Design a protein around this ligand. Structure first.
Ligand SMILES: *[C@@H]1O[C@H](CO)[C@@H](O[C@@H]2O[C@H](CO)[C@@H](O)[C@H](O)[C@H]2NC(C)=O)[C@H](O)[C@H]1NC(C)=O
Ligand SMILES: *[C@@H]1O[C@H](CO)[C@@H](O[C@@H]2O[C@H](CO)[C@@H](O)[C@H](O)[C@H]2NC(C)=O)[C@H](O)[C@H]1NC(C)=O
Ligand SMILES: [Cu+2]
Ligand SMILES: [Cu+2]
Ligand SMILES: [Cu+2]
Ligand SMILES: [Cu+2]
Ligand SMILES: [F-]
Length: 497
């Protein structure tokens, strides 16, 4: 029941009750989470998105981002509203037609208009590798081995009151889970395994906000992929996974036939597992159909620490092995005050004309681009370093860069940089007060690429900038289809702009 790489995808409103509480939602493919979109490395995806939304309480416009896919030469298909396109209006459709050369791994898709993905438009996106170097580590890798972690809110995203704290009402694992308050014994998700087999579990955070402490009672987890990047095998018994991150791990079904709790503890909202909140079930074939009776340890033996991860391939680190050892070394001042986030003193407010369209129309330096102060040019064919020192309220903030993955030269909670063999990924926690999480990449992908905190509430409140990478080559690199050119006139007509 995976769809793609060529598929329609209808975006609708419907009622759902994933924790026993009914509310309206914004859904892809009629379900929460949406159906898995899948193909093989190098495939041409043609995802024709039909906007059938009618309920303005969750916005009737939409735009979809394919998280972690580089979109080289297809910046117009990336999805962030007012960065690479105007939204699709209701009753219209749009073909996101792109290729995935050189990528294979676990991704996801989500609305990238306002906080709409929180209202339900989120699902997995898997690019399989027919020649996967990790293939011999497991037996089973299919739709039944994808594990999504989601925060779910009873209050609609657009209706979250100004000046009140936002927390979720349930953790959903594979779309099901129980509410933190007024808990009812609604169905839990079951992940089924066969004793003796090995599974590539593809763990996807589709969170709007919390990070999760993920574990499986009685089991350990051997990480083999991080945000699309193959890793050396790293065995852990708990994974702290931040919004929008992905891991693949090998699960060896090597415990007695039985039932085992799957745990996903968010950093906000309900604490613990009373009444079966924050829980799913790992069930072995032949086990009794009943809840697990297992318990977690008080202290985990081998939690994931990001500096323990290393690429499977020899990826290195571009630039020179010291702070500022890049062609374009940046240090961002990341701040929060009075309900708004800012980067270098500027709070992101989406522009009327998408950044890409501004560039195609001839705006040719970043000082000419709107929003003023929110668009930073990057030079072509250059090593970029971005230091992201933490401290802003609401952390730990998982920062994400479109169009690229990056070397994590410095991770949370550890002052030592790694210029030799750090993991590469696309979403990274910037940690806690005094940290200096730092990323590096090379600019080989012309176009405007969003950089933002992936806590969606923080993005909405301004925690973003756009890197206008290689402005001079953006138009030649990214020819645009007529349907894309039609988006802004249709949107602005519908909204009387
Ligand atoms: C994080 O690392 C960056 C460099 O990657 C530091 O930036 C330097 O900051 C000082 C002022 O604090 C400037 O004088 C330097 O020009 C900056 N660049 C360098 C040394 O390469 C930054 O201070 C670090 N931040 C924290 C909080 O540790
Ligand atoms: C803090 O981060 C550093 C840098 O990633 C880690 O240092 C590496 O540790 C490994 C394992 O012992 C050594 O092989 C490397 O040579 C170290 N690299 C550097 C540059 O020092 C360190 O382990 C991390 N600290 C903790 C507690 O995990
Ligand atoms: Cu994303
Ligand atoms: Cu993205
Ligand atoms: Cu944030
Ligand atoms: Cu984004
Ligand atoms: F992305």
């Amino acid at each position: 029941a995976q769809i793609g790489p060529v598929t329609d995808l209808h975006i609708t409103n419907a009622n759902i009750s994933p924790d026993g509480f009914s509310r309206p939602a914004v859904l892809a493919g009629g379900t929460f989470p949406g159906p898995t979109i899948a193909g093989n490395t190098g495939d041409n995806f043609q995802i024709t998105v039909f906007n059938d939304l009618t309920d303005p309480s969750m916005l009737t416009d939409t735009s979809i981002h394919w998280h972690g896919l580089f979109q080289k030469g297809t910046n117009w298909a990336d999805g962030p509203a007012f960065v690479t396109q105007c939204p699709i209006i209701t009753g219209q459709s749009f073909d996101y037609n792109f290729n995935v050369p050189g990528q294979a791994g676990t991704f996801w898709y989500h609305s990238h208009l306002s906080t709409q993905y929180c209202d339900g438009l989120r699902g997995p996106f898997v690019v399989y590798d027919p020649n996967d170097p990790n293939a011999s580590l497991y037996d089973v890798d299919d739709d039944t081995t994808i594990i999504t972690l989601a925060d779910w809110y009873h209050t609609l995203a657009q209706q979250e009151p100004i000046g009140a704290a936002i927390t979720a009402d349930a953790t959903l694992i594979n779309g099901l889970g129980r509410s933190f308050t007024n808990t009812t014994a609604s169905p839990l998700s079951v992940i089924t395994v066969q004793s003796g087999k090995r599974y590539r579990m593809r763990l996807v955070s589709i969170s709007c906000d919390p990070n999760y402490l993920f574990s499986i009672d009685g089991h350990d987890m051997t990480i083999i992929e991080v945000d699309g990047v193959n890793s050396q095998q790293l065995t852990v018994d708990q994974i702290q996974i931040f919004a929008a991150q992905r891991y693949s791990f090998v699960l060896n079904a090597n415990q007695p036939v039985g039932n085992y709790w799957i745990r996903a503890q968010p950093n906000s909202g309900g604490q613990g597992f009373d009444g079966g909140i924050n829980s799913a079930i790992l069930r072995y074939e032949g086990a009794t159909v009943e809840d697990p009776t297992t318990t977690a340890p008080t202290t985990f033996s081998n939690p994931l620490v990001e500096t323990d991860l290393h690429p499977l391939a020899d990826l290195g680190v571009p630039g020179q092995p010291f702070r500022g050892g890049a062609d374009d070394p940046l240090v961002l001042n990341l701040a929060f005050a009075n309900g708004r986030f800012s980067i270098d003193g500027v709070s992101f407010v989406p522009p009327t004309v998408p950044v890409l369209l501004q560039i195609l129309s001839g705006a040719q330096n970043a000082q000419d681009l709107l929003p003023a102060g929110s668009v930073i040019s990057l030079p072509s064919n250059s090593v970029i370093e971005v230091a992201l020192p933490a401290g802003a309220a609401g952390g730990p903030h998982p920062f994400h860069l479109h169009g690229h993955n990056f070397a994590v030269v410095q991770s949370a909670n550890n002052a030592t940089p790694n210029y030799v063999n750090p993991i590469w990924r696309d979403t990274v926690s910037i940690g806690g007060t005094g940290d200096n999480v730092t990323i590096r990449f090379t600019t080989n992908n012309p176009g405007p690429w969003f950089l933002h905190c992936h806590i969606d509430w923080h993005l909405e409140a301004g925690f973003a900038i756009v890197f206008a990478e290689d402005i001079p080559d953006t138009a030649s690199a990214n020819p645009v289809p007529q349907a894309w050119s039609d988006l802004c006139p249709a949107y602005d007509q519908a909204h009387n702009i």
